[PDB]
Scaffold this active site. Structure first.
Site, PDB file in Angstrom:
ATOM      1  CB  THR H   1      12.849  42.434  54.043  1.00 50.84           C
ATOM      2  OG1 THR H   1      12.128  41.443  53.301  1.00 50.84           O
ATOM      3  CG2 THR H   1      14.338  42.132  53.992  1.00 50.84           C
ATOM      4  CB  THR H   2      10.690  38.505  57.413  1.00 50.22           C
ATOM      5  OG1 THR H   2      10.797  39.477  58.455  1.00 50.22           O
ATOM      6  CG2 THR H   2      10.961  37.131  58.009  1.00 50.22           C
ATOM      7  CG  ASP H  17       8.536  41.324  54.768  1.00 45.30           C
ATOM      8  OD1 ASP H  17       9.224  41.023  53.770  1.00 45.30           O
ATOM      9  OD2 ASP H  17       9.002  41.949  55.731  1.00 45.30           O
ATOM     10  CB  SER H 130      15.739  43.241  59.248  1.00 45.00           C
TER      11      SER H 130
END
Lengths: 215, 213, 239, 80, 204, 239, 240, 202, 222
Positions: H1-2, H17, H130
């Site tokens: 994930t961001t 996201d 991440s």
């Protein structure tokens, strides 16, 4: 904190005539990543004491909140008494040793610096609760790198002035910036005096890269 | 992962006498290969008649010294008298055994004058088994120091050599010499020696230099 | 006697006189509150009496917001009222946490009332000497009005009053519902104000009363300003 | 006699605890203080259930030779 | 596995107005038989039976605990438990120890108290109830006896045919495993009677 | 009658007085007198001990809490012993934790809290003992008194116990000179002050006097029967 | 009549008389007043000197319950000190959890609820203290709150507690505090306390004052002695 | 994930996201990691989904009760402090990285970053998850003081697109929110709307 | 196990296989993996079967109490929150993957709950060993605002794809349709596979099995 998550390195301190100075880089590293670059790893416990930390920043913030509330409550009862740097150092030694005995360690190693009753104080506290007092202190890789220089100048000159002590910690910070990966260019300097605690803002080290062209 | 111990080094020595006791120690604190500080005496004055020396994990040394001081105060309050050296020894044995299962990593030596007026030294393992001894060395350099004390003070393995009661001067000479040798050939021990001698007058502290590394 | 003076013990006629005394404690305050329901709105009005000029008028209030879309008016001991208000807010938030939707007004009233029951059954603590009236909008049922009392009775109502003039006020309201034609928002507020003013004889000014409303158009509980209250009051006097 | 037996038991266990912990013999004053502390607990400052609400209806005379020589101590229901 | 430590086999089958429940008799510690008379089927009613295979200790323990609960149930409610209700009770008992489970694989077989409709079910280690209309099996030899049941079983069997089928299946299945055997007992439950027979089997 | 309102600490009286606390405050009057006074460099405690009989030894009226604090008691010896244990453990905890002597003001604050808890709750009685706390700290010499009511005071000098008003008036008329006194002058002043409390037939003796001194260079020491003779000899006679 | 014995009880006419009896406790106390003005809040207490022996700066009725708030008490001093400990604990917990200095309205509500807990239960008596709380924050502004033994809490532009409450209240009423500033308000507080003090019944008093406001940068503090002396001289002059 | 937040004058822009994964399987490709803790306080959730959802609901509960009893809009620093206390006290058992952003009248738009381990930092822009690793350089170069709201929205979109293309755990659609005094404007960028950058294309 | 759900225009359709496997032997066929929580909320279960059964039963009982007290039909969000909070408290040690489907006053809601307490509201969801194949079918052919028959066909196709492709699944297919108006629980909706005819009869005649002993105990029918 069984596992450190976000950590800072190398708080240095040396005691000069009429006070103590401590300095620290402003980086908290998320395991080889310069994630946080403006964090302050030095605190003003009271007018007579400073504290700075290396290791997990979360543990530092928790200790900040606890110790600050302690300082506040003594100020509230307001009988004219106040905590000495020796007192803060002793309590911190007890707390870290207790958390070690509980196998829930606070990962940080801290420098307590203060000037009260005309006598300077500079003391070490480790995550295991090892504690001592000494003329100069360096945590992290500072112990291996900076502390030789501090010890040399202090052994030849037991007493130092504020100006030369400041130049010394700047020089040691330059060395640590050269030879420690977790370090950062920007660092704070903070000095306890008879007047009180003043923490200087982001300060930076002039760096010599002359040997690069020598190759 | 987290190791609750680290060996902070140092050595302690204690040698009794007919009318005196001596307790002596290094003043170096060393974590790993680095020297934390060169002035951290391991000897602590519990009472006028007693000194304790502790070597091992420094956090355990500190907490045990605080505990012993507090319980000394408590005994004084309750019984209206000072703890004797034997009483401190038994109390220390119980305190150490309290944490049999998460022990204090400390080697302790209690040196003092007994009720009769003679010198007494009590020596402790990390888990609190204790024995009265005429002399003993504790800590990192126990192996190096104790044989020479056994030879000179105990006159062991010496044939056709007269047995003399140890004197204060000879004892202090011997202590300085053995600590010099341990400074030479033990990495952990050096950079000063604090000699704490207890007599009917009281504790007297002398410091002598040992070689910096 | 001695059959009073403890909540647990029953009278020989089985009446539990202590809770009945708690009901008197509400009237001891000398204030009245009225709540009336409408087709698309519910309103709560109550007297606002400032004993001293020095008191900050903003701080003194008997209207509290249990949650964004529920409002209450408490009558009785001020401290017990505030405590019950806090318990109601906790119950509402805990309901939202556990069940994922805003607490219904009826279930909030039921929770507070059964708490009042545990008070009136256990020995050491005393029933809180206060009465609550909750107003909110439920999507299925439209507007709602409910009342808790120290006993644990929590019945819903078309319109109600609490305080010293409760009997006079409910006599007034009973006549008005009997001649039922409707109640829009303005008529609802006017009915509440006329009931309170008539039973008290006060002929109020805007400072003397505090009104809170909920409406299907704007579900959030809001406490009207002195200007809005004066707007309603002047309309009453003109006609 | 009964609460006397209780206080005697307290005295005995405290003497032996002192021997265990400090390898020495208690003074008569210290033993008398030890039992007196138990006698004081009628006040019920402690939250423990197993302390008699009534004061101990007995007076004791403690006689023993200590470091100070022969000593005779008196104890009363108050715990003084 | 720990289940294989003592070893066992339990089976139940559904015919027409009848049930059969059958189980081996061996009790042995990993390989050494101790006794050929172990009780793995226990009565939980007039025409309701439970069969436990797994650890012998947990077999006996859950049987005793279930009889405790069932006797209190029968006394309190003044009726015989329905088979489905016994299933639910056993499932609750096993799931109570979802962590640190009783190592058993129970099988319930019986007739309804009033309808006399036949009921067979099995439960897992942690009380997952499975009700079947043909057969249920549990123990070390589940694989073998599953295949044998899937072949031999036929719907709407007579009591005698049910006995023949369950007997053949248990015998041929326990022949092909090491840790179960040493005889097999077949209980046949009909509305009017209980018939218990011990078959002749290889003692190896 | 008003025998009611006196039974327990938890019952307020119709004029806002908790009578059990006052009845506890009467307890300090029962005990033998004590006097405490301070100078710029020292704090002193002096006491009049009592004996059950000629053969019996005199009771202990001065107790040492720590090197920097010691107390003298008037009222129940049981409560005195309990509170002294609590104070000693608090000081030991402060030394263990912070490695500093506990401030005397903070210690009396802790005593006040611990003493206050009985008064408000049903159960344990108020501590029916009055203590004079004297100690030296970084701020300076200090003397405090604590009542069976948890309220505490800071004093230039104070006397508690039976017939202590005479000592208080002597202290008040002689107070101005106390601040600049030597320790000998100060202990002599306190001895005369407690001599005021004694019966006219009785006189100060080595036996019935105990003196407690603490200062910048002096840890708390109780000068016993033999050791009070240097301080007592200076005193002249009864007036 | 056994109705007044306990706070769990109700009178037949709906009155909990133990709480009123506790409210009568504070009237025994010497007066204390707090006035709120534009800049901040000023507190004042008439601390009667019971004996010359007692040290000055003792029996303080003005407490600092946090850096930004101060507390003035009337009623039983033991209960008041305990309530101050409770308030300090509440403020510290608020800072620790929510990360900022406690709002005064919330602090008053929490300590008031703690007080109100005691009126309900039979085992424990109501508190015997009525106290005022005051703070200044640039966001919230000047705030003054008073808590009775019941647990009722309200905000007061001016407030008085203790023996001379009514007279102090009329004197405060004729003041126009809203426009005024703190350095004048200290003088007028001294005037009011000197007025309400009864020389015959009460032998002597030492005026104890405090304030919080912008002049402190939002910290409650004891008055500097020069300002105390100026206000006291003004009060003596005005008294005539 | 961001997850990414950036502070513009008078508010904040949040972005995240939509991809959540179990191993290499995209269990939900349309997840919403931007949650309302309050009307003007949001949290961007990264780390363990269960941990983040639980802590988010708990903080929502506590902040709502606090806001109603204080009768005032809650502070973003208060919400961040609650998040810190939870995450620090349960740092051993919890795996969450939160960015707390919102608007309060006292201090305007604020962004706070709670990494794993339970520490609180205020940041002009914060990135987490991440995929934040890959876009540290882009945010460091691209960020300029005093960006407008639309400029910050485009900045967040471009950064999240870069992290999404370069990170497998990250992906899906870009969910963007702008919180200010006026209110929350939530938008989703999908397909062609998502910013795209050229490939080497030998 | 394959369980799957979809939201159609006016409700939900839920689907699951009917096979229970202990190890790699089919312990059961015709197992029911669609559970009753409420009249308007049904839930499929996968993972540890006992955990699924017991947690669904517990939440069913709690929602029965909640609906009885409140006097209105239970909401799906309440079921989701109860489930997720219990699962989060147990930290995944109770192993259940759940497809939660019900219609309420708000509308049709489908939720997917993982063992650790995660939840996701989606138009279509799948869980179990066959989740990937079922999701392949859904990703291919799902469209918004489907009719009831179309949704039933899609869910049947997905569960069938899970049945044939995945080993753990395989038996008859179950469907459940929840609408605002009505509920249709469809134990076997389809029977994709059947056991073949046994060519040879092995029925054992009487006397085939020897018996060492026998005891007939008559039951007192009454």
């Amino acid at each position: 904190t069984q596992n450190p998550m976000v950590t800072g390195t190398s708080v240095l301190g040396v005691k000069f005539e009429g006070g103590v100075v401590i300095a620290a880089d402003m980086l908290g590293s998320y395991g080889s990543l310069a994630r946080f670059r403006n964090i302050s790893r030095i605190m003003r416990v009271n007018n007579s004491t400073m504290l700075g930390a290396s290791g997990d920043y979360a543990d530092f913030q928790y200790l900040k909140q606890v110790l600050g509330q302690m300082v506040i409550d003594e100020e509230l009862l307001g009988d004219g008494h106040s905590y000495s740097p020796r007192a803060i150092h002793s309590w911190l030694t007890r707390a870290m040793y207790s958390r070690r005995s509980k196998m829930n360690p606070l990962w940080n190693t801290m420098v307590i610096g203060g000037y009260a009753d005309g006598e300077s104080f500079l003391g070490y506290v480790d995550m295991l609760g090892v504690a001592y007092e000494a003329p100069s202190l360096a945590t992290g890789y500072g112990a291996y790198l900076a502390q030789p220089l501090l010890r040399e100048v202090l052994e030849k000159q037991p007493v130092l002035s504020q100006t030369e002590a400041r130049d010394l910690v700047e020089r040691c910070m330059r060395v640590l910036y050269y030879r420690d990966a977790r370090s950062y260019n920007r660092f704070q300097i903070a000095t306890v005096t008879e007047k009180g605690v003043e923490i200087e803002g982001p300060l930076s080290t002039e760096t010599n890269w002359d040997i690069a062209h020598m190759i | 992962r987290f190791s609750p111990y680290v060996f902070n080094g140092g050595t302690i020595l204690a040698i009794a006498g007919e009318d005196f006791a001596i307790v002596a120690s290094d003043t170096r604190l060393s974590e790993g290969f680095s020297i934390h500080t060169r002035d951290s005496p391991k000897c602590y004055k519990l009472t006028d008649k007693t000194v304790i020396g502790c070597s091992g994990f420094h956090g355990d040394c500190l907490t045990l010294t605080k505990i012993i001081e507090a319980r000394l105060k408590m005994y004084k309050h309750s019984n209206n008298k000072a703890m004797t050296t034997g009483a401190i020894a038994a109390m220390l044995s119980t305190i150490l055994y309290s944490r049999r299962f998460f022990p204090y990593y400390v080697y302790n030596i209690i040196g003092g004058l007994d009720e009769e007026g003679k010198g007494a030294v009590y020596s402790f393992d990390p888990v609190g088994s204790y024995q009265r001894d005429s002399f003993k060395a504790g800590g990192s350099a126990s192996a190096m120091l104790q044989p020479l004390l056994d030879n000179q003070v105990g006159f062991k393995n010496m044939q056709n050599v007269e047995h003399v009661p140890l004197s204060l001067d000879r004892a202090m000479r011997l202590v300085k010499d053995v600590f010099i040798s341990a400074a030479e050939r033990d990495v952990y021990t050096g950079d000063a020696l604090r000699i704490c001698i207890v007599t009917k007058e009281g504790i007297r502290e002398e410091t002598v230099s040992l070689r910096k590394d | 006697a001695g059959f009073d003076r403890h909540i647990t013990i029953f009278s020989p006629e089985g009446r539990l006189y202590q809770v009945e005394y708690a009901f008197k404690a509400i009237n001891q305050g000398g204030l009245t509150s009225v709540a009336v329901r409408g087709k698309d709105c519910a309103v709560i009005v109550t007297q606002k009496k400032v004993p001293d000029k020095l008191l900050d008028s903003s701080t003194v209030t008997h209207l509290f917001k249990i949650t964004e879309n529920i409002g209450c008016v408490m009558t009785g001991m001020t401290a017990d009222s505030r405590s019950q208000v806090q318990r109601a807010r906790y119950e509402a938030a805990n309901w939202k946490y556990k069940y994922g939707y805003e607490i219904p007004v009826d279930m909030l009233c039921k929770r507070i009332a059964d708490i009042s029951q545990v008070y009136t059954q256990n020995a050491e603590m005393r029933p809180l000497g206060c009465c609550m009236i909750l107003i909110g909008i439920d999507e299925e049922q439209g507007p709602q009005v409910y009342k808790c009392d120290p006993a644990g009775y929590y019945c819903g109502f078309k319109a109600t009053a609490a305080g010293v003039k409760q009997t006079e006020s409910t006599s007034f309201l009973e006549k008005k519902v009997k001649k039922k034609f409707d109640w829009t928002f303005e008529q609802t507020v006017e009915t509440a104000i006329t009931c309170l003013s008539t039973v008290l004889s006060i002929d109020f000014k805007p400072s003397e009363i505090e009104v809170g409303v909920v409406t299907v158009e704007n579900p959030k509980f809001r406490i009207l300003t002195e200007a809005e209250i004066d707007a309603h009051l002047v309309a009453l006097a003109e006609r | 006699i009964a609460d006397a037996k209780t206080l005697i038991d307290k005295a005995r266990v405290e003497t032996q605890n002192h021997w265990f912990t400090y390898n020495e013999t208690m003074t008569v004053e210290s033993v008398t203080q030890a039992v007196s502390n138990l006698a004081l607990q009628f006040g019920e400052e402690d939250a423990d259930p197993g302390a008699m609400s009534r004061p101990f209806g007995v007076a004791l005379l403690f006689g023993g030779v200590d470091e100070k020589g022969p000593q005779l101590f008196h104890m009363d229901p108050s715990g003084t | 596995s720990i289940m294989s430590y003592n070893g066992g086999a339990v089976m139940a089958m559904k015919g027409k107005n009848c049930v059969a429940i059958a189980a081996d008799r061996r009790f042995g510690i990993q390989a050494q038989m101790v006794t050929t008379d172990f009780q793995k089927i226990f009565p939980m009613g007039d025409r309701l039976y439970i069969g436990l295979a797994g650890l012998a200790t947990d077999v006996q323990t859950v049987a005793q605990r279930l009889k405790f609960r069932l006797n209190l149930y029968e006394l309190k409610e003044g009726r015989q438990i329905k088979p489905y209700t016994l299933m639910s009770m056993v499932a609750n008992l096993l799931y109570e120890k979802r962590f640190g489970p009783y190592y058993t694989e129970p099988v319930i077989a019986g007739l309804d108290p009033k309808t006399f409709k036949p009921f067979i079910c099995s439960l897992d280690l942690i009380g997952c109830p499975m009700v079947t209309d043909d057969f249920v099996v549990s123990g070390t030899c589940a694989e073998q006896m599953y295949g044998m049941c899937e072949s031999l079983w036929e719907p709407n069997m007579d009591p005698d045919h049910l006995f023949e089928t369950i007997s053949q299946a248990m015998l041929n299945a326990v022949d092909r495993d090491a840790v179960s055997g040493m005889g097999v007992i077949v209980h046949i439950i009909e509305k009017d009677k209980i018939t218990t027979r011990t078959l002749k089997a290889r003692m190896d | 009658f008003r025998n009611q309102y006196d039974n327990d600490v938890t019952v307020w009286s119709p004029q806002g007085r908790i009578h059990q606390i006052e009845y506890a405050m009467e307890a300090v009057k029962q005990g033998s007198a004590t006097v405490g006074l301070k100078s710029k460099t020292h704090a002193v405690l002096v006491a009049l001990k009592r004996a059950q009989s000629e053969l019996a030894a005199h009771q202990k009226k001065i107790l040492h809490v720590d090197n920097h604090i010691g107390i003298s008691i008037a009222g129940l010896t049981a409560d005195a012993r309990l509170l002294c244990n609590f104070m000693r453990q608090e000081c030991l905890d402060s030394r263990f934790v912070f490695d500093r002597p506990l401030p005397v003001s903070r210690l009396v604050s802790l005593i006040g809290s611990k003493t206050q808890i009985p008064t408000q709750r049903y159960g344990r009685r108020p501590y029916g003992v009055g203590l004079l706390i004297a100690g030296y700290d970084d701020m300076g010499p200090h003397i405090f008194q604590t009542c069976p009511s948890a309220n505490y005071f800071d004093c230039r000098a104070m006397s508690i116990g039976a017939r202590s008003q005479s000592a208080r008036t002597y202290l008040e008329r002689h107070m101005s000179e106390f601040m600049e006194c030597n320790l000998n002058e100060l202990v002599k002043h306190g001895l005369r002050a407690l001599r005021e409390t004694l019966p006219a037939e009785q006189d100060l003796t080595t036996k019935n006097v105990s003196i407690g001194i603490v200062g910048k260079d002096l840890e708390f020491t109780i000068y016993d029967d033999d050791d009070v003779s240097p301080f007592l000899e200076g005193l002249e006679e009864r007036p | 009549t056994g109705y007044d014995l306990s706070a769990s009880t109700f009178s037949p006419d709906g009155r909990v008389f133990q709480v009123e009896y506790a409210m009568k406790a504070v009237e025994n106390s010497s007066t204390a007043i707090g006035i709120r003005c534009k800049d901040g809040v000023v507190f004042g207490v008439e601390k009667l000197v019971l004996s010359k022996l007692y040290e000055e700066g003792s029996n303080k009725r003005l407490f600092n319950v946090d850096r930004h708030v101060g507390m003035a008490v009337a009623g039983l001093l033991a209960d008041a000190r305990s309530l101050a400990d409770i308030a300090r604990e509440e403020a510290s917990n608020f800072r620790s959890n929510f990360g900022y200095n406690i709002p005064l309205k919330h602090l008053a509500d929490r300590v008031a609820m703690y007080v109100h807990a005691y009126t309900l239960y039979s085992a424990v008596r109501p508190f015997g203290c009525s106290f005022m709380l005051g703070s200044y924050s640039v966001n919230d502004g000047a705030q003054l709150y008073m808590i009775d033994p019941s647990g009722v809490s309200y905000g007061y532009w001016g407030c008085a507690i203790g023996k001379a409450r009514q007279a102090a209240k009329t004197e405060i009423e004729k003041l126009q505090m809203k426009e005024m500033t703190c350095r004048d308000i200290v003088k007028e507080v001294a005037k009011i306390i000197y007025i309400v003090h009864d020389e015959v019944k009460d032998k002597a008093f030492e005026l104890e004052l405090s304030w919080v406001g912008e002049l402190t940068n939002g910290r409650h503090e004891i008055v500097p002695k020069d300002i105390r002396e100026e206000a006291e001289k003004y009060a003596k002059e005005s008294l005539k | 994930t961001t997850i990414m937040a950036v502070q513009f004058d008078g508010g904040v822009v949040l972005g995240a996201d939509s991809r959540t994964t179990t191993g290499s399987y995209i269990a939900n490709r349309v997840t919403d990691k931007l949650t309302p803790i309050h009307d003007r306080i949001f949290c961007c959730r990264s780390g363990s989904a269960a941990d983040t959802q639980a802590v988010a609901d708990a903080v929502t509960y506590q902040l709502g009760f606090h806001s109603i009893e204080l009768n005032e809009p809650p502070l973003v620093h208060t919400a961040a402090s609650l998040f810190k206390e939870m995450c620090y006290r349960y740092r051993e058992d919890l795996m969450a990285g939160i960015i707390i952003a919102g608007w309060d009248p006292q201090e305007g738009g604020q962004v706070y970053s709670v990494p794993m381990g339970g520490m609180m930092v205020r940041q002009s822009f914060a990135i987490g998850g991440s995929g934040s690793s890959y876009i540290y350089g882009y945010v460091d170069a691209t960020y300029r003081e005093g960006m407008t709201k639309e400029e910050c929205l485009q900045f967040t979109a471009n950064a999240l697109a870069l992290a999404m293309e370069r990170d497998g755990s990250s992906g899906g659609v870009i969910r963007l929110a702008a919180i200010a005094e006026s209110g929350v404007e939530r938008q989703v960028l999908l397909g062609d709307q998502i910013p795209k950058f050229a490939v080497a294309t030998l | 196990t394959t369980i799957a759900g979809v939201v159609y225009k006016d409700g939900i359709v839920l689907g699951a296989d009917t096979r229970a496997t202990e190890g790699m032997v089919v312990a059961d066929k015709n197992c029911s993996k669609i559970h009753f929580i409420s009249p308007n909320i049904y839930c499929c279960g996968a993972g540890t079967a006992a955990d699924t059964d017991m947690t669904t039963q517990l939440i069913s009982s709690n929602l029965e109490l909640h609906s009885l007290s409140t006097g209105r039909l239970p909401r799906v969000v309440t079921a989701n929150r109860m489930l997720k909070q219990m699962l989060f408290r147990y930290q995944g040690y109770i192993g259940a993957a759940l497809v939660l489907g019900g219609v309420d006053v708000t509308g049709p809601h489908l939720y997917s709950i993982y063992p650790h307490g995660s939840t996701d509201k989606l138009p279509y969801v799948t869980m179990g060993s066959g989740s990937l194949a079922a999701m392949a079918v859904f990703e291919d052919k799902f469209r918004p605002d489907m009719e009831e028959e179309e949704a039933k066909n899609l869910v049947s196709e997905a569960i069938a794809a899970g049945i044939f492709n995945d080993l753990g699944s395989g038996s008859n297919i179950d469907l459940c349709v929840i609408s605002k108006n009505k509920l249709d629980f469809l134990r076997p909706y389809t029977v994709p596979n059947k056991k073949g005819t046994r060519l040879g009869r092995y029925r054992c005649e009487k006397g085939t099995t020897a018996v060492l002993t026998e005891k007939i105990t008559p039951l007192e029918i009454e």
